[PDB]
Structures are given as C-alpha cells and as structure tokens.
Amino acid sequence: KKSIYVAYTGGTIGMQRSGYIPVSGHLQRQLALMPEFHDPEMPDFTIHEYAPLIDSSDMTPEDWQHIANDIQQNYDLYDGFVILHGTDTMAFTASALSFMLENLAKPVIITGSQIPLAELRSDGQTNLLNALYLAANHPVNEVSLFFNNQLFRGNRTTKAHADGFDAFASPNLSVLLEAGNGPLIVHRITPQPIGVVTIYPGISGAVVRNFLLQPVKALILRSYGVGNAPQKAELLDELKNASDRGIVVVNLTQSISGSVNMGGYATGNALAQAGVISGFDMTVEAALTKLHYLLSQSLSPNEIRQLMQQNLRGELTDT
Amino acid sequence: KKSIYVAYTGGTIGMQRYIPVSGHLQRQLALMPEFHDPEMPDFTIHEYAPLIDSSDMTPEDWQHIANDIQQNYDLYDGFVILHGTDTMAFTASALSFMLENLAKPVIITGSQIPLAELRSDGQTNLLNALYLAANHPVNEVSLFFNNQLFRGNRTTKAHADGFDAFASPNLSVLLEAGGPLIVHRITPQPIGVVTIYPGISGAVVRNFLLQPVKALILRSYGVGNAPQKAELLDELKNASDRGIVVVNLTQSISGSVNMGGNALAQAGVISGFDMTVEAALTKLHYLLSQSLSPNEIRQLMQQNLRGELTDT
Amino acid sequence: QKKSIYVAYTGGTIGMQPVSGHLQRQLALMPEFHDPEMPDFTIHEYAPLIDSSDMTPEDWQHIANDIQQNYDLYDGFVILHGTDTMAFTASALSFMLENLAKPVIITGSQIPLAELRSDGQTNLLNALYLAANHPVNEVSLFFNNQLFRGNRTTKAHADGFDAFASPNLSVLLEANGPLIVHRITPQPIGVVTIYPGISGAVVRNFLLQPVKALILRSYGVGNAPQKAELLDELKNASDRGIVVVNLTQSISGSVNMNALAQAGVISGFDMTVEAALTKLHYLLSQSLSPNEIRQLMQQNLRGELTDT
Amino acid sequence: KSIYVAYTGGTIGMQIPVSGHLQRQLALMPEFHDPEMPDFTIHEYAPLIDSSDMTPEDWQHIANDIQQNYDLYDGFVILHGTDTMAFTASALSFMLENLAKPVIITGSQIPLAELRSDGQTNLLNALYLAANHPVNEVSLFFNNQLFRGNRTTKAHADGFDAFASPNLSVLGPLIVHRITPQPIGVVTIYPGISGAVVRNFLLQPVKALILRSYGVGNAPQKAELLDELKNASDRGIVVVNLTQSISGSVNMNALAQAGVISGFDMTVEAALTKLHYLLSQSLSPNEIRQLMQQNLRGELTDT
C-alpha cells in the first residue's frame, strides 16, 4: 500500500464557511468520515497542517523554502507528496519547487480548490482525491499541479480564469494527463529584487531607468509578439546600461501562448544587441521563480544568463 | 454603393518578399478582381509615409491615425486601418477612447503573410474588413483577424505568432465571418505596468512609483489580491496620497478584479475590473492627456466609457 | 424540511457490484447524499432489473406507470438506467408524459456507483440535486456534467464519460391541463440509411408488412436519388398508408424539404433518430390515421424539433 | 507539376449547372495562375452528376478517368457535390490499390465565382496540396482540413463545416478494382424491433446487412432477432455490426454466436463501400467476413 504525505499549507480547500475561516484539524475531521478517502485502492496518507496557515496571496520565497524543506525532511518516508495551497499563487509555488527540488524522483502534486472540501459538490473533494490517487498510482516524478481534472507540469502553469473551477492552464505545454539520477538536492532560495514589467508604445527612458535602480538584479520584460520592442535608443540604451552593470534582463512575450524568437545573434536583433536574453515560451511564474533560484546561488550574471536560457526542469521549449 | 477609407499605416500585409515598396499594396489589389466585385464597396488607400513597424508605434502615431480618420470622416461610410500585428490591440484600444461619438465603423486589421503571397491571410482579412465596414457596420473600433471581429478595446495578443493572433478573453466575439465626432490630443504619459509576485519588495515598488510616474497598473493575483505587508501597501498609499492613479488588473488570462475593508482599496488602489492591459494603458493615456484631476481620473477609469469593461 | 425525490432504479451498471438493496445500502454510508442541500430520496429497485440493450416499449410503459403512481407523492423523479438505450427511454417518456409539471431526470453511468472515481456517484448526486433545486418540468437526461433535453439526446462516444450529446439543441444547463400518461405499444417501424445506387428491391424489403412506418436517413438537407426505382417504392408505401419520415444522415442539422415530398415523404426536421422512432411509436399507439400521424410527426409536440 | 481536375458535379462549378462556366470563371482568377501553383487540366463530365444521384457506376467512371489519366499527371482532384462526397472517397480508397499519387476530393456550399466563396479556397488548396504536399491516398478537403477519405462522414447537414473524421485525426504497382451496385441493407436497431421486420430486411436479394446497434455493439438478447441474423449468416449473408454512436468502436458474444462480425470503428460510408468492393470481387461469405475485419486501406483500427 502506498503512503502519501499531505502538506496543508493553506487555501480555501481546508477552511469552513462562516466568509471562509481557518479551523485547526477541520480537514482531518472531514476526511475521517469520507469513505472514498479510505477505499482499499486509495493510498494511506498523513496530513501536516502548517501553523500558521498561509493565505497564498501573502506567500513569500521563505514559504517556498518551508515547503521544500518539509518535502526534503519527509522524502525517504513516503511514496509521494501532495501540497494543498491557495489558488492565488499556486503556480508560483509549483514553479519554484520545480527548480528547488533538484533530482526529484517521487511525485509532488500541488492542488487546492475554489470551494472548501466539505461543501456539497466542491472541487476540493475531487482535487484532493485525484492528487492522492495519481501520486500513488500514476506517479510523474516532477512537481505537477492538479486542477479541474488535469495534471499540468507545475513550471508551465499560469492562472487561466481569475476564479472558478478552470483556474489554471499550461499555455505552452500539453497537460501531463487527464483524470477522466542522484540524491535530492535542495538549496536555500531567498527573496530577490526583480522587476517584472510590460513594454507599451512610447514607454520612456526615464520610466525604464527607474525600474532598474538599486536594488534591482534582474528585469523580466513582457514585449510584443515574438519578442519585439521599440527600436528607440531611449529604451535600448537603458537596457544595455543595465546589462553592462550585471543586471539579467529576460525577454518574455505578452502573448497568452507562444514563444519569444529573437533569431540568430547574427540577425542583429535589437534587444539581443542590448544584452537582453530570450525567455523562449516561459511563463511569468517560471521566469520569476527561475531567477530567484539562480540569483540565490553564487553565480555570475553571465552564468545566470546561460542557465536562464537552458531548459533545466521542462519549463521551456528551445526549438 | 458604400465607400471605405483604408489607412495603410504599416505591417507585413502591404510588404513584398519582407520590405516596404511604396504603392505596392494599391498596385497589387488592382490585379485582384475579388476586391472589385459588385458586392464590395469602393475604397481609397492612403499609404502612410513613412510606414510604421507596429513594434515602433508611439502615442503620436495613435494621434496621426485618429486625425486621419477625423479629416476623412464625412467623406467615407467607414474606415479600415491596416497595421502591424505586434501593437494592433494597443492602437485599437487607444482609437476607441480617442474617437468620441464615433458613429461609423472603424476596423483595424493586418496579417502574418503579405497580401500578394499565395493563400495569405492578408487577402482574407482586408476583403472581410472592407466587406464588414460597408455591409455589417458596428459603429465602434473593431479588430478583425482570423475570421473574427473583436471589440477593439477588449483585444489582446493570443498567440505570439500564427493565424490565431488575437483574442477578446472577457467579451464574446462580435461576429464570426464564416454629439459630433470629438478627438482630443493624446500624448505619451509616464505609466508603470508591473506584475506583483511573492515577496516583491517595497524598494522595487518604490522605484516603480518615482517621478515622473503619474499612474501605475498593478497586475495582481486572482480577483485582485496582493500581499498584506505594510512594505507594499504603505508605498501604494504614499503614491495615491500624492495624486498617482494606481489601477488593479488581474494577472489571469480571463476574469475580473473584484475589490468589493479591502486592503488595496484602503491604500487608494482602484479596480480595473476585467480590462485588458491594452485598454487600461491606453485609457490612462486618454485621461492623463486631458486636464483631469487624479480623483476625476480614478472615477473615469472605473466607468465603462467605450465598452472596455464589465462592472456588474 | 426538504424536497423528496423518487428514484426508480430500473437497471444499469450504476447500481451493480446484480445485488438487491445494494444501492440503498451503498448510499446510506455516503454522507454527501445526506447533505442539507440534498433532497430526501426514496429508491425503488425494479424486479427484475432491465438490461437497457433488451429494453422494450412495455418497459417504457412500466417506467411511465411508476412515475404516474408516484406523481403526487414526490417533488421530482430520477430514473436510473443503462446507458445503451437511455436516449430512447428519455425520448419515449417525453411523449408519454403529456403536461408533465415536475422534473424527470434520467441518468446512469459507465462505472458502478461504489467504485472509486465512478461517474455513477457524480451523476446520481447531480440528478437528485438538480431535480430538487433547479427543477425543469420536462424529461431531461444528465450525463458528463450536462443536463440535456431528453428527446434531443443521442449517443455520442461508443463508451466513455462523454456518451451523450444534443446535436440540434443547447444543453438545458451545465452542473396545459393535468398530467396525462399515454399508452405505448411496440410498433413495426423500419429505420434505414440511403446510399449510392440503393436498389428498389432492397427498399421494397424494408416496406413489406407488417411495417407501418419507415424512417429514412438521407443526404445533407434530405436529398435522395431522382430515380423512379426508389421514389416509386416510397410513393407506393405512402399510397397504402405507410408513414415515411425523412431524417438527415448528418451528425447535426435539419432536413429542408421537392421530389421526396411528391413521393409522400414528410420532413423529420432536425429530430434525432431516438425522437423520430419513439414519436412514431407514440402516434401509432393512438390508432390515428396515416394523415393524422404525418401532420403530428411534423409538429413540435414536446420540444423534440425546430421548425424554422 | 500538373494536376488533373475531374469536374463531376456540385454547387462549386455552377451558376444551376452551366456548360463550360467554371473553366471561363477560372481564366479570370489570377491566384490560380500563380507561379507556386501547379498547372492543371479540367475534364467537365458530360453529363454532370448531382452527387445525390451518384451511383457505383459513377465511382467506376471516376476510378477509370483517374486510371486512364494516371501517368499523364502528378495528382488528381475530383470536384463533387457535398451530399455523397464521403461515399465516393471511401469507394475509391478500396478500388485504388497500391495508390502512389494524391487523389483529393472536394466541392463547396458556394459556387467558386461568388464573393468570399469556399469554392475558391477549396479548389486552390486541393490543387496546392496535391502538388506541394502529396499524401498518396484518397483524401477529402473541406473547411481547411485534409481528411483520410475512408474515415470521413457528413458532420453538419450544410454549412462550411460539413465533414468530420470522428475515429481518426486529419492528415506493387497501381491495381484498379471493379465495383458494381450491390444489394446491401443499412438498418438501425431500436427497442422491441420485431424478428418479422428484421427477417424482411434480410430477404433476397440482400447479400449483406450493416447493423447500427447500441454503444460498443449491443443488440437485444432475444431469440426473435438473433435467430434471423443467425439464419441469414448460415445462408451466407454478411452481417456487420457498427456502433450507433457518432465516434468510437464496436468491441465484440451473442451477436458473434449469430455469425455477426465487428465493423470496429468504421464509418457507415467505409463499411458500405468496403462491402461494395468485397462483394464486387470473387469472394465467398467467409473470405468477405475476414477481409471486412482487416484494415485494408486505413479505414479501421483494431487495438
């Protein structure tokens, strides 16, 4: 019989209608009476309730680290791991854990719900039951995100709908599944001063200059189409000056789906000549958490630029 | 028989194998008799000199197109704007605010592949924009692409590349194709458009709100939630207390901010409901370019001016 | 306290383990079925259970009669049934329950209710919930999180959770005078598909006694060969009081009727096979004349067809 | 490169049909004379065929027109009415054994000349694909999709989205087989269907019966019906079980004890044409029943 560790970090799933309030042991009490969670074909599971519970819109890198450390501490003791989490930043946590759990060789499924588990026809019951069932019986040895009958690669996920049952999508990768080597290495991630900004017509040098002031170590630029920005020295000079002082400037597309394609370096692509590197088809969550992972280590800006473009954990498609 | 004005502003649609040759688009269409079908309207092409690569568009370029439509407004039955795909949704959004009391169709379109090339979407998009402007008039700024007519100020880039370039995530497409006009001077405006993320520091957000910034679009989580840390909320409140307009949009592909005791509201942040980034960025340009006070701008940003937002 | 729903367990995998009282025992220990937002329900298990692949029109009448018996004793009705012919039963009941003023929801599943991750658990729970809290006073069919109009449903995927569709009508939703229950008896009807070069000989065989009606599945908006060999057989059948109804062979759309009309064939508009087959049973069982039946087949009696 | 265009009939080359009006309309549409477009030659059938009046001799007429022109060209396009296009495509897939040049069938809702007509798009792409991206099978082109011919069925009764391939994703020397009309019953089982009515369906001259039964191929377990299917099979009638469902496969057993064989996931058009193909050749009932169950031309899946 398989055994799954369930980290209840926070989220509506384990709360009680009142609006929703946290109640200690509420999830343990409800699952004891729900016979499907004790079927012979279901794994054994153990709940660790975080004290205190985290509202996911308040999540910080320190919380990513706590979750990683909890998995690491329990790694040898279970067949797989389910993280319950609030929906607002679930994709950030999934993305960050993909980088932090190096040589992961058991399943980690992050999930949660729109509605508390105990409510009639809540997605909480289906999401938790499928996360347990899949980690035990159809293991994918990566950090996945389970929502609305789909298992996504965690570092490919973004919020689809601001709320409701179809909360998540993986715009640039097929779902891993429809529910119809080396030792685990965890390094310590810390908060990093990153700007995430969107280019728009006429964006000023003065504005951009200010986005790049200390303490900023990296900038994610969301640019047009396959990664184009204004051909204006006013913008390109501030981006080049930044990279010349060691800022990592990463190009993502504004588009819902698709890839930055800055072409060969020999094409003299204007952003590329200003020191900007391609983020290919990464999500904002994957690029933001990847920069946290790399800036948290002792790597040079050139080492980070190289690793930002390499597919480390299945987060990006390069050609 | 209807008459349509075509502003060829820029984009691949009018280019040849890809470089700009002046007069090329007009010469190519005269060879293509479907454009001269009895059920098609007459049209006149004004080729911009110089042509604009849409990744280089500025608000001055919005002004140029608005002024062109204004100059030609009484002389035609409708208007087609040919434009590069990269910022087409910015221009459609800006023209929706700029063309006040518009009462003729304005359809913006373009293509991946030049008109002349075999099986180009260029030929289909221009034929349908002309046809719809004359025969199926919606007297607003619309965007036509991939056999769909979108509300301009509801449009955003769907795929970075390819035929399925645009979507209106928060409004149904208008159409599957299977007072007098007022125009004020819009100018560039120092606006920050930033995304919140876990642990985002007060010092980074303080940088985004330095002078000369007049407004900040925040892309926040879910139905509009941000971290409850005084480090962030104190900086947003400092900015609103000195007249900066701080607008909350969701980082979600679809859906609406719902700010309702709300922490961001207490810090002076206003809801952008379900607006696109392109609608909110162009709407702040539209309002900041006028003489309006910060309080006026906060109220008008929340009002549905042109069909750009749903507030129920 | 709460609404009360009558659950007729007529047959189907949903209730199996073929063990009497099993469904009642299973549901007693499933707490979600006793939620405060759930209605009370009463289960009646048919003795014997019906395999839906052997359903006859007498089984249709048994279900209609059971609803009649219980009509004034409950707020709504859920019919559990085998998937193979669920759409025929839903179609037949829509005709037989004239002036229905309470919800009837037919459902079942691919997997027994008791199995982990079964659709039987989801289907029964939503049928109960919908019958009580979102009543539609018609015969509806619930499957794969969709409530369809019963006489609009047809089989979609041979198996799998997505086994029904309503190709000519939107879903009812996404989770006059009193009731007259009609009698339906078995009727000799042919249901056949036209193809290139189909001989007058083969169509004659379809129209032999004791056939009273023929459903033709024809091309696009209802086209048949302009060949006297075929139209002669059809006009001959119609002249001796056989009702010939034209359906399209397409997955969706309507017959738009003209040569077949001249051979006495009438339009089935956008009806499903299930609707047209059960509607002919309904009308033939009333001893109406061929002309009365041809008219009523073309009228929208229960929401089964769109006419312009 | 050079494509042969058999203009058999259909709304596409019409105005009502007008002798020669297609060829003269095309002369005035320069995209068809683009340098990246192959050369092509139109054969206007005399007389044109309303695809609803199509017969298997018309399938022969088309197969032979192809065979004759086979060496003269790089590929073939059949312009055809929409009503029975999938039947024609399925039939040619079986007849055109060892095919090594593209055959694409197409047509339209709207005559080629009309503004925003799908006729224009369909002919241009059928010519383009046959030259520039050859697939050596009988294919059907509609609503910007290239289907395997013997996997296609009528989707909507009209409209631009009229065809689907529900059980398959979009896409020796040539031996051309004969085909003739064959007496085949295509019937739908329903609750309580009488043994009398089924007995009548199976009377001479019927050589074969396609059943559209429930789900994965279930029929009533009543002797009335099984006896008549078994009696017809015992005297050499080929009874093929197809699902009534829009998609999916028969998986067979009561019907198999009565001699009925599985049509797997075939379309009605493929089973009905495969029976025409097999019955038109020198085969016993047992040989036909075996070949019906083997994937001959990409028409069926069996695990």
- 3-state secondary structure string across chain B: CCEEEEEECCCHHHCECCECCCCHHHHHHHCCHHHHCCCCCEEEEEECCCCCCHHHCCHHHHHHHHHHHHHHHHHCCEEEEECCCCCHHHHHHHHHHHCECCCCCEEEECCCCCCCCCCCHHHHHHHHHHHHHHHCCCCCEEEEECCEEEEHHHCEECECCCCCCEECCCCCCCEECCCCCECCCCCCCCEEEEECCCCCCHHHHHHHCCCCCCEEEEEEECCCECCCCHHHHHHHHHHHHCCCEEEEEECCCECCCCCCCCHHHHCCCEECCCCCHHHHHHHHHHHHCCCCCHHHHHHHHHCCCCCCCCCC
Q: Which of C58, C189, C195 sits opposite D186 (nearest CB)?
A: C195
Q: Which residues of D are catalytic?
A: 11
Q: Among B21, B16, B73, B23, which Cα is nearest to B47's?
A: B23
- 3-state secondary structure at position A57: helix
Q: Chain B interface, mutation test: which of A189, A196, A216, A281, most B Cβ atoms within 10 Å?
A: A196
**How many other CB atoms sit within 10 Å of the CB of residue B36?**
11
CA dihedral B292, B293, B294, B300 (to 10 degrees): -50
Q: Which residues of D touch C225 (CB under 8 A)?
A: 52-53
Inter-CA distances, A305 with A235, A244, A245, A285, Å: 20, 13, 13, 17
C115 assigned to a ligand binding site: no
Helix or strand holding residue A99 (H, E): helix A90-100
DSSP string over C47-61: SSPPPGGG--HHHHH
Residue C126 forms contact with A (CB below 8 Å): yes
Q: In whole angstroms, what is the distance from residue B281 CA to residue B259 CA? A: 20
- Neighbour subunits, A (≥3 Cβ pairs < 8 A): B, C
Contact at CB, D37 and B131, closer than 8 angstroms: no
Contact at CB, B118 and D36, closer than 8 angstroms: yes
After which residues does chain D break, using C–N > 2.5 Å?
15, 171, 252
Q: Which of A42, A120, A125 sits opposite C116 (nearest CB)?
A: A42
Q: Which residues of D touch B119 (CB under 8 A)?
A: 124-125, 128
* Beta strands A20-22 and A15-17, pairing class: antiparallel
Q: Are residues B85 and B11 in contact, defined by beta-carbon separation less than 8 angstroms?
A: yes
| Nearest residue in C to D224, CA atom | C54
Q: Among C68, C31, C288, which Cα is nearest to C182's?
A: C68
Helix or strand holding residue C210 (H, E): none
Distance from the first to the final alpha carbon of chain C: 45
Q: Work out the minimum CA distance from C45 to partner chain D, whole angstroms.
A: 21
* Beta strands B270-271 and B245-250, pairing class: parallel
Q: In whole angstroms, what is the distance from residue A234 CA to residue B287 CA? A: 25
| Nearest residue in D to B125, CA atom | D116
Q: Which of B53, B160, B253 sits opposite A259 (nearest CB)?
A: B160
DSSP symbol at A189: P
Q: Are residues A212 and A219 in contact, defined by beta-carbon separation less than 8 angstroms?
A: yes
After which residues does chain B break, using C–N > 2.5 Å?
17, 178, 260
Q: Which amino acid is at A250?
A: V
C-A interface (Cβ pairs under 8 Å ≥ 3)? yes
Inter-CA distances, B154 with A25, A53, B69, Å: 45, 38, 21
| Nearest residue in A to B203, CA atom | A215
Q: In whole angstroms, what is the distance from residue D245 CA to residue D263 CA? A: 13
Paired residues of A224 in beta bridges: A228
Evaluate the CA torsion angle C163, C165, C171, C172 in order and state its sign: negative
* Tokens, residue D77: 């396009």
CA dihedral B232, B238, B242, B247 (to 10 degrees): 20
The data reach a resolution, in angstroms, of 1.8
* Beta strands B215-220 and B245-250, pairing class: parallel
Q: Among B294, B265, B256, which Cα is nearest to B154's?
A: B256
Q: In whole angstroms, what is the distance from residue A129 CA to residue A36 CA? A: 8
Q: Are residues A71 and A96 in contact, defined by beta-carbon separation less than 8 angstroms?
A: no
Interface of B with A in 214-243 (CB under 8 A): 217, 219-229
Catalytic status, residue B12: yes
Q: In whole angstroms, what is the distance from residue C185 CA to residue B141 CA? A: 61
* Tokens, residue A30: 């409800």
B274 assigned to a ligand binding site: no
Angle at alpha carbon of residue B199, lines to B195 and B200, rounded to 5°? 40
Q: In whole angstroms, what is the distance from residue B124 CA to residue B144 CA? A: 10
Residue A317 forms contact with B (CB below 8 Å): no
B9 assigned to a ligand binding site: no
Q: Which of A33, A35, A133 sits opposite C117 (nearest CB)?
A: A133
A24 assigned to a ligand binding site: no
Q: In whole angstroms, what is the distance from residue D223 CA to residue B257 CA? A: 65
Experimental method: X-ray
- Neighbour subunits, B (≥3 Cβ pairs < 8 A): A, D
Residues 6+ apart with CB under 8 A from C298: C266, C267, C269, C307
């909320």: which residue's tokens? B233
B-A interface (Cβ pairs under 8 Å ≥ 3)? yes
Q: In whole angstroms, what is the distance from residue A301 CA to residue A96 CA? A: 20
Q: Beta strands of A20-117 (E only): which ranges?
A: 20-22, 44-49, 80-84, 108-111
Q: Among A202, A204, A223, which Cα is nearest to A212's?
A: A204
Residue D125 forms contact with B (CB below 8 Å): yes
Contact at CB, D157 and C253, closer than 8 angstroms: yes
Inter-CA distances, B3 with B42, B295, D90, Å: 5, 43, 48
| Nearest residue in D to B147, CA atom | D116
* Tokens, residue A318: 């390069």
DSSP symbol at A37: G
DSSP string over chain D: -EEEEEE--SGGGB--B-TTHHHHHHTT-GGGG-TTSPEEEEEE-SS---TTT--HHHHHHHHHHHHHHTTT-SEEEEE--STTHHHHHHHHHHHEET--S-EEEE--SS-TTSTT-HHHHHHHHHHHHHHHS--SSEEEEETTEEEEGGG-EE-BSSSS--EE-TTS------EEPP-----EEEEE--TT--HHHHHHHT-TT--EEEEEEBTTTB----HHHHHHHHHHHHTT-EEEEEESSSB------HHHHTT-EE-TT--HHHHHHHHHHHHTSS--HHHHHHHHHS-SSS-----
Q: Which residues of C touch A121 (CB under 8 A)?
A: 32, 125-126, 129, 175
Buried b (16+ CB within 10 A) or exposed e, C107-128: bbbbbbbbbebbbbbbbbbbbb
Q: Which residues of C touch D165 (CB under 8 A)?
A: none
Helix or strand holding residue A150 (H, E): strand A150-153
């061929």: which residue's tokens? C290
Angle at alpha carbon of residue A157, lines to A155 and A163, rounded to 5°? 145
Q: Which amino acid is at A292?
A: H
Q: Chain A interface, mutation test: which of B51, B54, B86, B187, most A Cβ atoms within 10 Å?
A: B86
Cα diameter, chain A: 67
- 3-state secondary structure at position C98: strand
Q: Which amino acid is at B300?
A: L
Interface of A with B in 248-267 (CB under 8 A): 253-261
